[PDB]
Amino acid sequence: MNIFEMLRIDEGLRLKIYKDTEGYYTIGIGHLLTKSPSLNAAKSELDKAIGRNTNGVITKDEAEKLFNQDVDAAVRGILRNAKLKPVYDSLDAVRRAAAINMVFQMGETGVAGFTNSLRMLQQKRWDEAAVNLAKSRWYNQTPNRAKRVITTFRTGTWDAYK
């Protein structure tokens, strides 16, 4: 198990434009296109991302390319943030994957609300951090996925993805 396999499980793979859990146009392995309700706007973002006129359908290779870019971007986003970097750096490789997962799902400023959780994670107060992470819109809206990610933070194992 690794970050790619983990996010592949949590996000799935769809080669046609679909709406994500929040109702937003998405493609591939959870590649958010736009928050606009316009399918045409979404198709435009897709074409821009792929570099060709797609009309809402991509290949597996194209999906995986976007996925690689997105995972890369998530990690880079963490390290660029002078406040988030220390927490990330304090973690083992398994928990780092859990951090990337959350960033991927909500954006580093979607994680702005997780300040208190982050503090407990840096303190390695795993059970306390786990309890705190669940007190969130995130957990309530996507409980199955949140439970998996939280278990990964609690244990530092891949048990939730077995």
Ligand X SMILES: Fc1c(F)c(F)c(I)c(F)c1F
- Helix axis angle for 39-50 and 60-80, nearest 10°, is 90
Q: Closer CB to ligand X, residue 50 or residue 75? A: 75
The structure tokens listed for 130 are 């786990």
Respond yes or no: is residue 11 known to be catalytic. yes
117 is in an annotated binding site: yes
CA distance 106 to 128: 22
By C-beta, is 54 or 117 nearer to ligand X? 117
- Residue 88 binds what, of Cl ion, ligand X, none (CB under 5 to 8 Å, by partner type)? ligand X
Which one is catalytic: 5, 10, 20, 22?
20
Choosing from 10, 11, 45, 70, the catalytic residue is: 11
For residue 32, list its beta bridge partners.
26
Rounded to the nearest 10 degrees, the angle between the axes of helix 93-106 and helix 143-155 is: 150
Residues that bind Cl ion (CB under 5 A): 144
CB of 160 closer than 8 Å to CB of 147: yes
Binding mask 52-91 for ligand X (x = CB under 6 A): --------------------------x-----x--xx--x
- With residue 16 as reference, give the H or E element that holds it: strand 14-19
3-state secondary structure of 160: helix
Determine whether the annotation assigns residue 144 to a binding site. no
Among 20, 47, 108, 128, indicate the residue that binds ligand X (CB under 6 A): 108
Beta bridge partners of 28: 14
Distance CA 52, CA 114 (A): 38
Compare residues 3 and 121 and give the one whose CB is closer to ligand X. Answer: 121
- The one of Cl ion, ligand X, none whose footprint includes residue 1, by CB under 5 to 8 A per kind, is none
> Which chain residues interact with ligand X by CB under 6 A?
78, 84, 87-88, 91, 99, 102-103, 108, 111, 114, 118, 121
- Give the residue numbers marked as catalytic: 11, 20
